[PDB]
């Protein structure tokens, strides 16, 4: 059935930066989470909502982005939606896409908007019915924001997601919004909303997944107010301040299921622990949506088939191991995910780390809280402390220690990285 197909656009490249040392080799929307590219986590979310027509904005690596999509599963006839890709200027800012949208006049009716890549399992099919109803009597209903009930200090609620909402407890209408900044000591709103609202609720327990349900007018509106760049600090603020004239937005606070956005370094770690922990069922390794061979084991251990688990190697809890990957003797792994085809030396110690496709670690290596990108090699007797981040190709010489947060690279920017061994105090490329 038509239903105006229910469109949905995905704003990649929006948060391309903060994952800086790696996003220059491959874009954020394609790096692996639990040995799986992000956008897949977002796509199956979209399909869960009944989307039938997807448009993806691209700026960085628009080729290998589309090339994946073309050879993806979503380019098949079994796919529930027809994904098209779109290229625009690099470092694309929100709204500037929306303005470029209606300039193509390709928005048919209500649609959903996602700035980045999302892991979630909430059925929006109820949110639209919430949205599309109260709209059919008030065509000034413009955006429905979906958010997750949580704790103020929840591990999955960081600064960008840390906001304060004020909602009409009866009709759920956000009448005031402001972000949490160190220094913004107070919450101030013109009281004339009280003369228009009987029962309000101030909440700091939300998340702001930024998965807004946008109406039909929104793109054209973003062309009417060309100043609007950020959907949260320019759009809504204009609506609440009556800059945009006589229009309303609404909030839908989910209380079950899961929803979050991969955006920051301090979230990739959190969400990985949140999908390893079965918080995003069915979107778990044990489902193997891409024909993987994963299987749940107790204490949240996930392995693929055909994996060399050496005897006397000890696998602790909350970790994940891809296929075709070897592990040496007397080695210890704990709370780390591991890409496919890796090779771990003997008598090593891993903890809280993140390993990607085919990575080689020598004997007697100690790792912790480190991201190790695709196809990287580490010599023996090495050691990597927390916060470290290395890109692809990088290789570390034997008997070496990379200090905390010392990001590296195999490219020619300002970052300290260079490939060949040794690569810390001993330097290549400088």
């Amino acid at each position: 059935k038509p239903k105006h197909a229910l469109q949905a656009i995905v704003l990649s490249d929006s948060y391309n930066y903060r994952f800086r040392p790696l996003t220059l080799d491959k874009p954020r929307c394609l790096l692996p989470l639990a040995n799986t590219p992000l956008i897949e986590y977002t796509f199956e979310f979209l399909a869960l909502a009944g989307v039938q027509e997807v448009y993806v904005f691209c700026c960085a690596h628009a080729g290998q982005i589309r090339e994946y999509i073309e050879k993806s599963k979503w380019n098949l006839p079994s796919s529930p939606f027809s994904v098209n890709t779109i290229v625009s200027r690099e470092s694309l800012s929100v709204g500037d896409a929306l303005r470029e949208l209606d300039s193509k006049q390709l928005i048919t009716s209500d649609f959903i908007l996602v700035s980045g890549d999302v892991v979630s399992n909430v059925p929006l099919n109820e949110v639209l019915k919430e949205h599309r109803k109260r709209r059919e009597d008030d065509k000034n209903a413009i955006m429905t924001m979906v958010v997750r009930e949580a704790s103020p200090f929840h591990r999955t609620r960081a600064r960008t997601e840390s906001s304060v909402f004020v909602i009409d407890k009866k009709t759920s209408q956000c009448v005031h919004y402001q972000a949490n900044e160190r220094g913004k000591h107070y919450v101030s709103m013109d009281p004339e909303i009280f003369n228009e609202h009987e029962e309000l609720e101030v909440r700091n327990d939300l998340i702001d997944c930024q998965i807004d349900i946008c109406s039909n007018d929104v793109p054209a509106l973003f062309t009417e107010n060309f100043d609007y760049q950020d959907i949260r600090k320019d759009f809504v603020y204009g609506v609440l301040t009556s800059d945009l004239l006589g229009k309303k937005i609404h909030c839908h606070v989910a209380k079950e299921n899961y929803a979050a956005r991969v955006r920051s370094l301090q979230t990739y770690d959190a969400i990985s622990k949140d999908v390893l922990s079965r918080w995003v069922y069915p979107f778990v390794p044990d489902s193997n949506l891409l024909n993987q061979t994963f299987s749940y084991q107790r204490h949240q251990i996930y392995k693929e088939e055909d994996v060399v688990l050496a005897r006397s190697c000890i696998i602790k809890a909350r970790t994940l191991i891809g296929a075709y990957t070897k592990v040496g003797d007397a080695s210890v792994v704990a709370n780390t995910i591991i890409g496919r085809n890796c090779t771990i030396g003997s008598n090593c110690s891993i903890d809280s780390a993140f390993l990607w496709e085919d990575v080689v670690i020598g004997d007697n290596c100690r790792i912790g809280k480190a991201i190790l990108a695709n196809s990287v090699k580490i010599g023996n007797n090495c050691s990597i402390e927390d916060g470290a981040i290395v890109a692809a190709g990088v290789v570390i010489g034997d008997n070496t220690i990379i200090e905390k947060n010392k990001r590296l690279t195999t490219f020619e920017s300002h970052s300290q990285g260079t490939l060949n061994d040794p690569s810390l105090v001993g330097i290549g490329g400088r």
Partner: protein
């Protein structure tokens, strides 16, 4: 999580722990209970630096009665109903009197 109503009126029914009476003796700058005292109490409920003095606790005020069971916090709640509860200040006198006819014959 803070909810707040607007169509709400006071009814001047307050119930206090005893110790607050000594506070009223000390803190002279309190004229009206409803106007001054209640917001004074609610500021101290959450405002950290607003800790001028809690000494009007644990001073053998008798809350067991020898070791404190209610010290590190001062609380204050509200309560709402559905019907028959207000106070006259003119315009109610016409109404509260009208409301006063669930009588008979």
């Amino acid at each position: 999580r803070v909810t707040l109503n607007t169509n709400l009126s006071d009814a001047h029914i307050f119930v206090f722990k005893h110790w607050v009476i000594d506070l009223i003796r000390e803190k002279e700058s309190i004229s009206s209970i409803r106007g001054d005292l209640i917001p004074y109490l609610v500021k101290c409920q959450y405002q950290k630096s607003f800790t001028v003095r809690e000494n009007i606790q644990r001073f053998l005020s008798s809350p067991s009665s020898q070791e404190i069971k209610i010290n590190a916090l001062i609380a204050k709640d509200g309560i709402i109903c559905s019907r028959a509860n207000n106070l006259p200040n003119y315009f109610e006198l016409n109404k509260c009197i009208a409301k006063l006819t669930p009588e008979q014959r």
